[PDB]
Amino acid sequence: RNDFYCWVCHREGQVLCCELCPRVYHAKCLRLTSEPEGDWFCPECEKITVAECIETQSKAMTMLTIEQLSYLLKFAIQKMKQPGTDAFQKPVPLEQHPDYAEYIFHPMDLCTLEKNAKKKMYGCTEAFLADAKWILHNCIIYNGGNHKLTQIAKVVIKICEHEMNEIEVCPECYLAACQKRDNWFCEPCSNPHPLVWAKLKGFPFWPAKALRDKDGQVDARFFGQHDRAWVPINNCYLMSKEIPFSVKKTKSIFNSAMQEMEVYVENIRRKFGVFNYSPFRTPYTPNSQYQMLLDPTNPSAGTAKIDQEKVKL
Ligand SMILES: [Zn+2]
Ligand SMILES: [Zn+2]
Ligand SMILES: [Zn+2]
């Protein structure tokens, strides 16, 4: 049953209908080349389609069954359900809001979202976020964009977006960080993240995992603190024995980071049999293979084939 309120701006008016879902849109809100002719699927349905196509699913999704994704969405829900989100934890009751269904054609709340996830209804992170966004749309429609509840619903969505992004960067990292087992940061992932010296401007060189490469920036997760930052690629070296010296305020904190990295290297050598340190100041390059080479003096031989286990995660 189609919505009356634009998915983008949350206002009524003349609105286009999606063929696949009940969302509607002002044409003007979509900034189109021209209005659609007939077969039209909205930006949410389009995203979901691209994300759920096996050939073009993310690295994260290729890693994961629908049931494994559902486990991770359960962790995301628990972050969304934090103290102060009470108003959104259960369906809106008609007792308190007798006219709710006159405005809100697709109710949603955190308990429904959680149940849906447990039932394996979501095929990708995009689909989970698209559904959670009904909570904010509905809040704005019914209560108004400047209502205090809208602040809360906005934070719930920003949390969801954050958690979905983390799943997509690396589902194995995400699960490890969620469960916080003993030395969780020292567990190598199935396609292990290269270790780098990473220098954020104004910060000392520090050991990190390189999680992804986007246009000249590296997404680095630092040993010790386990914080993150985009780092310019030319400020990232492959891990080496020789340390790029920086003046630092606390030696003990840097020591704890190096110790953690040492355990990680022991663990990767156990898991894959290899870890190659680089000559000092060797530039990190995207999708770096160096550390996983069987013979680092013979890069054409690549990484060793030992493998055909189903439980890769
Ligand atoms: Zn609009
Ligand atoms: Zn749609
Ligand atoms: Zn990972």
Q: What's the gap in Å between 276 CA and the centre of ligand 3? A: 19
Question: Could you give the CA distance from residue 225 to residue 254 in angstroms, rounded to a whole number?
Answer: 10
Nearest to 80 by CA among 35, 129, 13, 27: 129
Q: Pick out the residues of the known binding site for Zn(2+).
A: 6, 9, 18, 21, 26, 29, 42, 45, 170, 173, 189
For the chain, after which residues does the C atom lie more than 2.5 Å from the next written residue's N, i.e. where is it broken?
307
Instruction: Give one word for 3, left, alpha or beta, with left for phi > 0 and alpha for psi -120 to 50.
Output: beta
Vertex 289: Cα angle to 287 and 291 (nearest 5): 125
Rg (CA), the chain: 23
Question: Could you give the CA distance from residue 287 to residue 283 in angstroms, rounded to a whole number?
Answer: 12
Q: Which residue has the tokens 């030992």?
A: 306
For residue 209, the cross-strand partners are 195, 221
Q: Which residue has the tokens 């049999």?
A: 273
Resolution (A): 1.7
Question: Could you give the CA distance from residue 302 to residue 283 in angstroms, rounded to a whole number?
Answer: 18
Q: What's the gap in Å between 12 CA and the centre of ligand 2? A: 17
For residue 206, the cross-strand partners are 198
Question: Could you give the CA distance from residue 159 to residue 82 in angstroms, rounded to a whole number?
Answer: 10
Q: What's the gap in Å between 79 CA and the centre of ligand 2? A: 27
Half-sphere exposure of 255 (CA within 13 A, CB side): 4
Structure tokens at 147: 């209502």
Helices 43-52 and 125-143: crossing angle in degrees, nearest 10, is 160
